[PDB]
Design a protein around this nucleic acid. Structure first.
Lengths: 137, 141, 178, 75, 127, 191
RNA sequence: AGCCACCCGAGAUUGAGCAAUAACAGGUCUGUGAUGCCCUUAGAUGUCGGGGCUGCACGCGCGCUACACUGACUGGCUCAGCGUGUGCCUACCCUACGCCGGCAGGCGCGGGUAACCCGUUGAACCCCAUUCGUGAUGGGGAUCGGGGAUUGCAAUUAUUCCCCAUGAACGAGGAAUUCCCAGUAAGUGCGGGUCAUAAGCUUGCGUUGAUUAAGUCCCUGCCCUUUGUACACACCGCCCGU
């Protein structure tokens, strides 16, 4: 019966009562259901509740934690990119910046023309698994 | 008696509070962010399962002659969901389950004994049968 | 809803249904002369002769000029016929429905012309506009009385359907628009 | 196929209705509450716990899938 | 055809080690430093008796003048991650039918020689 | 208990078995006084074992279909005993007796078997077995339960209780009332 | 000759083992130092290195995961059975326990060819508390990322594991099609095999466990005759005339 708290913004998305808080944090890139589970627990927030509650001041702390993973003890392994090819330490990348770095890996791998890039550019599958019947229809 | 005469799901929670009544249960440095098991799609809701897991361990070691690291790792895990592949039983983390064991050994709830590992402490045989009566007198499932 | 004041079809009511989705024995087809009300076809009796084919490019969304055998006014099951049909040709009811789509669509905003659609107070919307023709006896009567309205320049503002907004901002342009 | 959403906000307008739809309530599951209101079904549970805390309704089932409540003892 | 600030606009660390520092490093450090797949190549493979080719890599780099690339250093192996002393050699990489000669650069460090040589078509079917 | 055995949380007594043909295919208190519906874990050992199994036990059996839900009676008897609770809080009646009435109005009277006539579709006005009348009652009751829950906030128990109550008295809101009549439609129909 | 019924019951009810007659241009020379005729034979067809067997607008099969609430979640409860496992002639285990690491895994030993240890094999389903609320939703995990273990002399063409993250079709599946009557269907895990690493393969296993014939030749195939045959290699046969 607690209505009056329903506006939140986690980067470039609106985070209202649609699901649980953490699962509503999952609208952006670099933030999965387990990574959103952690940042709210690094912020000590019950992710059980609703994002139509829990106003932005908690979330502005959550903004500081998703931008600073290792600084808030989101450790080196938990990251979407560990020890990256760009910003070479252990960076959890976020909503709009991961879409850069996912391309920035593969666009580099074609300038290097490594096998990851050569498969990805030629319409081929990056993975060496079978593409005779799958990866198509 | 045993602790098998009293309610086991009350027992893993009344002894969990008893390990909170211990005040320390020697938690690892990594429960806010861990996988903690390759079975689990999500990180735990809290950290207070660790009391319950040791309340589930000390009940388990009350019945054994002694057990340790590999034995706890089959208890709390289950089907490892293999995604596009068939799911299968395996064992998760062996560090935090050992951290459970060194805690109850450190609190003398269980203790390194025969049969390769930790059996009950006699203080634990008190403190389990103490809170067994606390389990039994409260409710009987 | 519908521009018929009557809710349901009657016995041997030649009705124009809407083939929404084909089902197990047949298709749960919904009437459109009467609002959206579901009826059924085969197994029993819809066809007369045996040539053993149903469609080549006929995809979905058809309309069936069918005759009500059984109607369940309480339970909601309307059994339909075409095997009995020697004289109930499909062209007459559909061209009547091609009018009666527009005869309904004229009389269902209304709600002085935006139009909206949807929705006003739906039943009271039709007692003022759509069913007041159906109240106006007979049923061949408001075949012409509605046609008296959408003969718009012969004349516009004559005999009643002076209900209800006034109506007259609809009655000038929205009759010509719908 | 299906695409439905209740209001996933804790809603006073539903819950004050829930406190006032309560004599119609005798079979009170959160899904009934989520359909008699637009409360979530998740948040129906916590709202009925508040309505349990009022003592107007009473648990008759408590299963991990779904609880069931019941307004005063027999009716 | 050589080390850093040349054949590298793709700067800082490829996997955790900056190529700018790496070319001043030795690869006995690089296998220790943030190069796990290279580590399994350089610790378990462990300098895998291609030394006559490795001599030839340093022979043809020496025999050619250092302002230019080496003449030809063909290999049959394609499992070779480019080392900082390797950087500059025009390495013929065999795909089981043909030798593919690749000049190896500060950007390509960490990549196998079978990643620049191909054994496979960008598949056509009349496509 | 040695005087009378009841249901696990209800009463096998005060059950009104009120059909003509369905005597001794519907019994919960006559020989089948069970707190726990489970006979031996098989019910197809004999053709006789159908009438041996009561309707309260076959309901726990005929629910677990739909291969992810097959091999789960412990989930089922949970949801089944949940569904009796959802009956009584909607009814007040004995939810077994609601289930017992649910077999009554869902059992057909005359059905049709296939026959051929001049290339055209005719079907023979035939009775079905009171064994089948129960088996056409239960299977249509078991269909509307999992289906209506399958994309709804309601669990199967809430949909099954609504399936039993609207078939205890035919309301045409349970799946079993609505599909019995189409079976009975063809008998007075063709030829 | 047999049936039905019931008694007992393990009842006149387990599942396989197993094969007549005859047939095969069934398949296998690449299982075979079973192989005729050959080929080549030191220039090999005896070899090593590298690669392809993986490739995809696609045709098909088999599997598998999916499509939520009996589901996902977070945990907690706890019940197997079949086997097997180092000390082996071309390469080698089960692992308690003790430890470190989220995990990956590392690791310390010791036990045990074994109803002795692994392993009181305390498996999964289950079972409960939840959070979730039927939202391509958290169902789904495709795809891919960065990085880390691990196996190998070599994985690159991601061998494999993991970590997070990018978070797909799919919300029930047409034409068609498959199977099957009780521990059966299904679900569930598990053991055995191929291995240096490397299963959605496979054979077993228990486990949870349905509805349904309980009949029939209707389909369909098979046996059993008669009948006609222009068929006889036998109707995919014949066989006409334009």
């Amino acid at each position: 019966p607690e209505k009056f708290q329903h506006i939140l913004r986690v980067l470039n998305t609106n985070i209202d009562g649609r699901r649980k808080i953490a699962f509503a944090i999952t609208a952006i890139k670099g933030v999965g259901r387990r990574y959103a589970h952690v940042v709210l627990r690094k912020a000590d927030i019950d992710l059980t509740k609703r994002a139509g509650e829990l106003t932005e001041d908690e979330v502005e702390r959550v903004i500081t934690i998703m931008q600073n993973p290792r600084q808030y003890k989101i450790p080196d392994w938990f990251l979407n990119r560990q020890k990256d090819v760009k910003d070479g330490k252990y960076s959890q990348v976020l909503a709009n910046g991961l879409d850069n770095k996912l391309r920035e890996d593969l666009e580099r791998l074609k300038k290097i023309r490594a096998h990851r890039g050569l498969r990805h550019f030629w319409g081929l599958r990056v993975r060496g698994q079978h593409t005779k019947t799958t990866g198509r229809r | 008696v045993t602790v098998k005469d009293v309610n086991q799901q009350e027992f893993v929670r009344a002894l969990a509070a008893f390990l909170k009544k211990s005040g320390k249960l020697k938690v690892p440095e990594w429960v806010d962010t861990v996988k903690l098991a390759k079975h689990k799609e999500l990180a735990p809701y809290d950290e207070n399962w660790f009391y319950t897991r040791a309340a589930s361990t000390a009940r388990h070691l009350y019945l054994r002659g002694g057990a340790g690291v590999g034995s706890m790792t089959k208890i709390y895990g289950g089907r490892q969901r293999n995604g596009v592949m068939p799911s299968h039983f395996s064992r998760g983390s062996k560090s935090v389950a050992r951290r459970v064991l060194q805690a109850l050994e450190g609190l003398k709830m269980v203790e390194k004994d025969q049969d390769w590992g930790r059996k009950l402490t006699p203080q634990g045989q008190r403190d389990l049968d103490r809170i067994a009566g606390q389990v039994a007198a409260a409710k009987k499932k | 809803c519908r521009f018929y004041q009557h809710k349901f079809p009657e016995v041997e009511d030649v009705v124009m249904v809407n083939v929404r989705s084909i089902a197990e024995m047949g298709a749960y087809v919904s009437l459109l002369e009467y609002n959206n009300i579901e009826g059924m076809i085969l197994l029993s009796e819809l066809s007369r002769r045996r040539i053993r084919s149903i469609n080549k490019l006929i995809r979905i969304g058809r309309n069936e000029c069918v005759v009500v055998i059984r109607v369940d006014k309480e339970k909601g099951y309307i059994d339909l016929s075409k095997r009995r049909v020697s004289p109930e040709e499909a062209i007459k009811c559909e061209d009547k429905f091609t009018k009666s789509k527009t005869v309904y669509s004229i009389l269902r905003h209304v709600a002085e012309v935006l139009e909206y659609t949807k929705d006003e107070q739906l039943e009271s919307l039709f007692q003022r506009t759509a069913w007041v023709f159906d109240d106006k006896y007979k049923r061949p009567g408001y075949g012409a009385y509605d046609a008296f309205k959408h003969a718009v320049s012969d004349p516009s503002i004559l005999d009643s359907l002076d209900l209800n907004e006034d109506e007259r901002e609809v009655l000038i342009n929205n009759i010509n628009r719908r | 196929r299906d695409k439905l959403n209740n209001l996933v906000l804790f809603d006073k307008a539903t819950y004050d209705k829930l406190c006032k739809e309560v004599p119609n309530y005798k079979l009170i599951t959160p899904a009934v509450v989520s359909e008699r209101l637009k409360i979530r079904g998740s948040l129906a549970r916590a709202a009925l716990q508040e309505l349990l805390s009022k003592g107007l309704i009473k648990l008759v089932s408590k299963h991990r899938a779904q609880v069931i409540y019941t307004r005063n003892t027999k009716g | 055809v050589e080390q850093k600030k040349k054949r590298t606009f793709r700067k800082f660390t490829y996997r955790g080690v900056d190529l700018d520092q790496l070319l001043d490093m030795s690869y006995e450090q690089l296998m220790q430093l943030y190069s796990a797949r290279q580590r399994r190549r350089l610790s378990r493979g462990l300098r895998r008796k291609q030394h006559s080719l490795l001599k030839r890599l340093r022979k043809a780099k020496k025999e050619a003048p250092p302002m230019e690339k080496p003449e030809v250093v063909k290999t049959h192996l394609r499992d070779m991650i480019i080392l900082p002393e390797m950087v500059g050699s025009m390495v013929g990489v065999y795909n089981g039918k043909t030798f593919n000669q690749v000049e190896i650069k500060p950007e390509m460090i960490g990549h196998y020689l079978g990643e620049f040589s191909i054994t496979y078509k960008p598949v056509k079917h009349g496509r | 208990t040695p005087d009378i055995k009841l249901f696990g949380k209800w009463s096998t007594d005060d059950v009104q078995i009120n059909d003509i043909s369905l005597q001794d295919y519907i019994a919960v208190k006559e020989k089948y006084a069970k707190y726990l519906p489970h006979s031996a874990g098989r019910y197809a050992a004999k053709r006789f074992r159908k009438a041996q199994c009561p309707i309260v036990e076959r309901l726990t059996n005929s629910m677990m279909m739909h291969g992810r839900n097959n091999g789960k009676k412990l989930m089922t008897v949970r949801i089944v005993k949940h569904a009796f609770e959802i009956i009584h809080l909607l009814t007040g009646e004995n939810p077994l007796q609601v289930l017992v009435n649910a077999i009554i109005n869902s059992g057909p009277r005359e059905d049709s078997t296939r026959i051929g006539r001049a290339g055209t579709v005719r079907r023979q006005a035939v009775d079905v077995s009171p064994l089948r009348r129960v088996n056409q009652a239960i299977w249509l009751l078991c269909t509307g339960a999992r289906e209506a829950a399958f994309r709804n906030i309601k669990t199967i128990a809430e949909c099954l209780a609504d399936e039993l109550i609207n078939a205890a008295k035919g309301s045409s809101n349970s799946y079993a009332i609505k599909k019995k009549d189409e079976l009975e439609r063809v008998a007075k129909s063709n030829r």
